[PDB]
Design a protein around this ligand. Sequence first.
Ligand SMILES: [Mg+2]
Ligand SMILES: [Mg+2]
Ligand SMILES: [Mg+2]
Ligand SMILES: [Mg+2]
Ligand SMILES: [Mg+2]
Ligand SMILES: [Mg+2]
Ligand SMILES: [Mg+2]
Ligand SMILES: [Mg+2]
Ligand SMILES: [Mg+2]
Ligand SMILES: [Mg+2]
Ligand SMILES: [Mg+2]
Ligand SMILES: [Mg+2]
Ligand SMILES: [Mg+2]
Ligand SMILES: [Mg+2]
Ligand SMILES: [Mg+2]
Ligand SMILES: [Mg+2]
Ligand SMILES: [Mg+2]
Ligand SMILES: [Mg+2]
Ligand SMILES: [Mg+2]
Ligand SMILES: [Mg+2]
Ligand SMILES: [Mg+2]
Ligand SMILES: [Mg+2]
Ligand SMILES: [Mg+2]
Ligand SMILES: [Mg+2]
Ligand SMILES: [Mg+2]
Ligand SMILES: [Mg+2]
Ligand SMILES: [Mg+2]
Ligand SMILES: [Mg+2]
Ligand SMILES: [Mg+2]
Ligand SMILES: [Mg+2]
Ligand SMILES: [Mg+2]
Ligand SMILES: [Mg+2]
Ligand SMILES: [Mg+2]
Ligand SMILES: [Mg+2]
Ligand SMILES: [Mg+2]
Ligand SMILES: [Mg+2]
Ligand SMILES: [Mg+2]
Ligand SMILES: [Mg+2]
Ligand SMILES: [Mg+2]
Ligand SMILES: [Mg+2]
Ligand SMILES: [Mg+2]
Ligand SMILES: [Mg+2]
Ligand SMILES: [Mg+2]
Ligand SMILES: [Mg+2]
Ligand SMILES: [Mg+2]
Ligand SMILES: [Mg+2]
Ligand SMILES: [Mg+2]
Ligand SMILES: [Mg+2]
Ligand SMILES: [Mg+2]
Ligand SMILES: [Zn+2]
Lengths: 135, 84, 50, 58, 52, 127, 122, 103
Amino acid sequence: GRKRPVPKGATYGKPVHHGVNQLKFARSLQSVAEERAGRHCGALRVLNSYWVGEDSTYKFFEVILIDPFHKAIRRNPDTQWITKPVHKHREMRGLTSAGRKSRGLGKGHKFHHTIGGSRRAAWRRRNTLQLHRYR
Amino acid sequence: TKGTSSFGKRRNKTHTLCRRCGSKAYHLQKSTCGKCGYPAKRKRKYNWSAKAKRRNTTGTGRMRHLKIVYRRFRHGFREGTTPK
Amino acid sequence: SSHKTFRIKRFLAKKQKQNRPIPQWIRMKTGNKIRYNSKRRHWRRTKLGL
Amino acid sequence: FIVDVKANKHQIKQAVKKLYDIDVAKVNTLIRPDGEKKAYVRLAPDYDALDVANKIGI
Amino acid sequence: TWRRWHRRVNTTQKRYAICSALAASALPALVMSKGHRIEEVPELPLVVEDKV
Amino acid sequence: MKFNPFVTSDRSKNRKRHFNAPSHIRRKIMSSPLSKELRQKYNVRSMPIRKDDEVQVVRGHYKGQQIGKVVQVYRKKYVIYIERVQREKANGTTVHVGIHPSKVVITRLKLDKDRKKILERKAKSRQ
Amino acid sequence: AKIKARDLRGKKKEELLKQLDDLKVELSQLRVAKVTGGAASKLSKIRVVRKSIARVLTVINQTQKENLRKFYKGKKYKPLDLRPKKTRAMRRRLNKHEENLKTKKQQRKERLYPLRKYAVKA
Amino acid sequence: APSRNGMVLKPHFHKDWQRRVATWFNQPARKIRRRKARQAKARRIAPRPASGPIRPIVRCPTVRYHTKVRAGRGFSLEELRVAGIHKKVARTIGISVDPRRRN
RNA sequence: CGACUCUUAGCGGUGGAUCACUCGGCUCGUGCGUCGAUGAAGAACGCAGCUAGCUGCGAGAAUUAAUGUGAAUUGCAGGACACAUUGAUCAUCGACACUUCGAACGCACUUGCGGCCCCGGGUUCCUCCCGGGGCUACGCCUGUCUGAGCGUCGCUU
RNA sequence: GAGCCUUGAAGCCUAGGGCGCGGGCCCGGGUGGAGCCGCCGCAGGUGCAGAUCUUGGUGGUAGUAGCAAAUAUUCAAACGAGAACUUUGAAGGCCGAAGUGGAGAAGGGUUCCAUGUGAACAGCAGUUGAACAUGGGUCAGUCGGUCCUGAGAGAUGGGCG
RNA sequence: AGGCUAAAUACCGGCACGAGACCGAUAGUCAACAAGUACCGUAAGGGAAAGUUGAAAAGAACUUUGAAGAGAGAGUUCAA
RNA sequence: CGCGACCUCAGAUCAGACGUGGCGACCCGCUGAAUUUAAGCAUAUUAGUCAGCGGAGGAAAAGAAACUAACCAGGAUUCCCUCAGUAACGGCGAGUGAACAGGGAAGAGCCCAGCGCCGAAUCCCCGCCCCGCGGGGCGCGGGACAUGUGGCGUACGGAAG
Ligand SMILES: [Mg+2]
Ligand SMILES: [Mg+2]
Ligand SMILES: [Mg+2]
Ligand SMILES: [Mg+2]
Ligand SMILES: [Mg+2]
Ligand SMILES: [Mg+2]
Ligand SMILES: [Mg+2]
Ligand SMILES: [Mg+2]
Ligand SMILES: [Mg+2]
Ligand SMILES: [Mg+2]
Ligand SMILES: [Mg+2]
Ligand SMILES: [Mg+2]
Ligand SMILES: [Mg+2]
Ligand SMILES: [Mg+2]
Ligand SMILES: [Mg+2]
Ligand SMILES: [Mg+2]
Ligand SMILES: [Mg+2]
Ligand SMILES: [Mg+2]
Ligand SMILES: [Mg+2]
Ligand SMILES: [Mg+2]
Ligand SMILES: [Mg+2]
Ligand SMILES: [Mg+2]
Ligand SMILES: [Mg+2]
Ligand SMILES: [Mg+2]
Ligand SMILES: [Mg+2]
Ligand SMILES: [Mg+2]
Ligand SMILES: [Mg+2]
Ligand SMILES: [Mg+2]
Ligand SMILES: [Mg+2]
Ligand SMILES: [Mg+2]
Ligand SMILES: [Mg+2]
Ligand SMILES: [Mg+2]
Ligand SMILES: [Mg+2]
Ligand SMILES: [Mg+2]
Ligand SMILES: [Mg+2]
Ligand SMILES: [Mg+2]
Ligand SMILES: [Mg+2]
Ligand SMILES: [Mg+2]
Ligand SMILES: [Mg+2]
Ligand SMILES: [Mg+2]
Ligand SMILES: [Mg+2]
Ligand SMILES: [Mg+2]
Ligand SMILES: [Mg+2]
Ligand SMILES: [Mg+2]
Ligand SMILES: [Mg+2]
Ligand SMILES: [Mg+2]
Ligand SMILES: [Mg+2]
Ligand SMILES: [Mg+2]
Ligand SMILES: [Mg+2]
Ligand SMILES: [Zn+2]
């Protein structure tokens, strides 16, 4: 898990938040690997990634990247969806498999917190104080 | 000897005119800017100061390319020139 | 300071270009209400500071 | 003469020799504080500065 | 901006007001007291032909 | 009544476009009516005025029977100046009086091929 | 005397260069006349001289650009100033052919099962 | 703070609701937009009828609404096979097809 | 009797309140979806005949070319006044041009110091010789060129 | 309201006439020059004597305090309408080489120089100035930066995030 | 435990746009005006004041006192 | 010892191409307090917000069920009215707080890995010819990727011979 970057473990708040040692970071390490790979190479497009190794400390992933300007990918129209500019940097918006699995969406009674789109859109639609002309 | 006798010793300017936004903020002793952050690749902007965005965002200078981007978008980026 | 870099002399050269009053024909123009240069900098009261 | 600031002694010397058809002994440049360059172009002793000034019209 | 601007009326009261206005348009004293010049005008509510 | 929703009835917007219209719009603004015999002869209501048009003034301090030729058209001031219409200063120097071209009845136009094309378009559009 | 663009566009570059050199000689002589005092009828003239220099330079650059395009037209990998300019998103448009390019399964599916036109009242 | 005999009130206004106030000032605007959308569809798309695909007779799952009836989604592939037509051929005819609906 | 002080009224004097006006804001709604490595936003400097600011431009610098309209811009002298040649201003702008810093990109930046290729004159040629033109930032993709291994193997000495 | 009017609306003043108990109002007289009011309903950012109220302006104080740190000025002439102060002659003094002298670094940016004006600035004054307006002025192989490292700051390889 | 997909939805940034039971230069955006300007702080940053002659300058020719500032006559304008 | 093939790699100012940065009102991902309330204050509320960081588009996200329900069963995502200030959470204090129906706008569905079958029938690049305007895209001859697996036939609604 991650350690809180506050100096000397001091939070300066209520006793809710003094747990500097344990913040357990809602994104997965697979999503961290996707972020680091795509941000080191923003010219590529992060498709997916998978686990290949662990010992104690270092967790090892292999990431597949798509080149949106090679001619074999600009042709073959089962692949042209990732060439479109709405798929730029999927790894940092949370559009891959590990990204969706870290966002925690899906159909069910176990996912009413993010009922549609995202949890912030669900918060928006549930705390919109809606007002009309005729009341 | 705290005030007017100590104002006379102020002689060496720490801030000098930077070269990206030009606002006298390039701190020479630290080799960085105080307003835009010149050795950083990105402009130093924040949300706690709305007036800094009001000074520094687009619409306050030339927009010498961006206005003619509007002027070409008004017709649709033509390539042919004219009839006779 | 009597010796300084080239950008400071560019800045001081533009300020010497600025330091001149309104000519007598712009006030004589049509639809004008500019009567004196309000951006007139004097070298004692206002210091430009590089 | 008054010269643009992007020129040097050699370009001023070549410009004078290729425009006014006269030889140049030396060129001393300063930056005039309005923003231009003041160039003192001393000519060869074979030429006459008064005659060159009358031919260029100053 | 969220002042309560627009006010809903019952549709029965809307139709009631329409019927009351159309009934009060038939009496000559009410329309002359509103100020329309009905001196030389013929009979109340005027019905013109289908060629109009 | 105004029906097209892409034109203003706003007083501020109309005065803004009027006092900041460019010169090719100000030529259309500074249009002048014609005399009754000339509009009978040409079948046109009004024409934009130019440098060499003869002018009878109908309203103002100078009124009627003063057919003169204009000299200057300040489109910045919306003012034509007439050669016959004079006013002395204090020091005996004459100067032309400011006359707006909407209070101007043109008695003689200037003949030009471009104005013949304009007049033909006016007559064809008036029909 | 006047300098017309249709007069400039018909001449060769060896005459345009000499006429430009003559315009710049007149430019320098009227700069000398501007510095000295009694040449007050030459300042609108130096205005129209520098506008004429701009016109001649424009005609020369137009001629050079169209002369470059006459043999860079139809060539693969044309240079960057001759490539289209429009905007970056319109550079990252695929193609009309790459947009209309469809896979064989979807093409055969549209061959077999096309959309129908109909009406349902009786 | 409380008073005489009135109902205990707990309004949910402690959160900063003033930023997120969505007031329907564009409700006739959306009405005109959606009128023009339906009219532009009926003009440009087809002589197909508005609300094009046909919907099934469907009973509502409840002990409350199951006495009533509803226009469903699709025609429940076993039903479509008994009617005897292909799936996408039915979709191009105008039959709405849902592969999930059982019988 | 005059001088000083107080209260009204008339007139006069910094003062700009009230009233009247608006090329201004504020709110709402609709239409479109638009930056950049082919150099973005921003900044510095410069440009008018008389030109400090704003506005407009980039050594072609108060705009160039083309189209449309059709005799002006204007405070002043001048300039094209021509239109049975091409035509001033204005708007559109679709063609050219767009100094320097700036993601800024040869290095950090003191406008300093270089390194290749080509062209002109300077002892007609490199040898740290002047001017001009092109290139020279990081990461990465596909393909080409070169070589590193006691990584694995084939054939032979 | 076939309301009021450039034959004078709003606004403002008034030792004028009046009404209502009062909130206030109507008319007359004087400036002003383009909009205003009455009734019935409707909606308010709708009435000020205060809040060490906010902004702006003005009195008593008041022609009052104050123009007093560093020994000191005086006569004649001149340009000038105008001189305790500007310039020159002369006299007497001070700073007295650790200077009230001659030039520099940082800092200022045209203040340096000439000509002209003296409403504005200089706490009085000017014919004077660092004020104003116009025009000038900074020339380098051999003076310094540029070259070098010092304390230190720093990117790539690498690591962290 | 792999992936795409238009529609209804949102928009206080931007390009034009139309309306207002809104405000009227101490109000309304800080800014109707050479406004993020003058100016202040080393810097982050803070941040103003400031609309109106006339229908057209026709902005007072000329005489006179003073060196001028200013003034008395005279004149333009319905009106100084 | 030398030559060659494959696999791991390094170099270049190799040919072609790509990301940086800005605006950020709407949208996505992370993490992220306290003033305030609870009349005190720790749990709670403020708030999964303010600030901070990273991204793209005119929309974004989501989107074809490892779903809802438990009866005469429905059937992608989104948006509105209801559900509902309800079930429920809470020093069960202050307060917080959904969902399934149901009615409407919108309607569009699909593809791939595996399984086998097709002698890789597939894609990238280079050179010349066939070509029309304002310009780049099909067909001929050899250089690579790919058998550690291109493309067609296939998608849980069954599919193939
Ligand atoms: Mg109610
Ligand atoms: Mg002491
Ligand atoms: Mg750098
Ligand atoms: Mg300062
Ligand atoms: Mg308006
Ligand atoms: Mg009580
Ligand atoms: Mg709060
Ligand atoms: Mg005031
Ligand atoms: Mg032209
Ligand atoms: Mg070169
Ligand atoms: Mg009343
Ligand atoms: Mg109030
Ligand atoms: Mg109000
Ligand atoms: Mg008061
Ligand atoms: Mg009171
Ligand atoms: Mg007080
Ligand atoms: Mg006082
Ligand atoms: Mg005294
Ligand atoms: Mg005393
Ligand atoms: Mg003293
Ligand atoms: Mg004397
Ligand atoms: Mg004398
Ligand atoms: Mg002595
Ligand atoms: Mg000593
Ligand atoms: Mg000394
Ligand atoms: Mg001096
Ligand atoms: Mg003098
Ligand atoms: Mg004084
Ligand atoms: Mg001065
Ligand atoms: Mg020497
Ligand atoms: Mg470091
Ligand atoms: Mg690194
Ligand atoms: Mg799935
Ligand atoms: Mg998905
Ligand atoms: Mg959508
Ligand atoms: Mg006022
Ligand atoms: Mg103000
Ligand atoms: Mg006027
Ligand atoms: Mg009067
Ligand atoms: Mg309390
Ligand atoms: Mg407390
Ligand atoms: Mg919480
Ligand atoms: Mg935030
Ligand atoms: Mg970005
Ligand atoms: Mg975009
Ligand atoms: Mg998705
Ligand atoms: Mg409670
Ligand atoms: Mg909560
Ligand atoms: Mg499925
Ligand atoms: Zn900066």
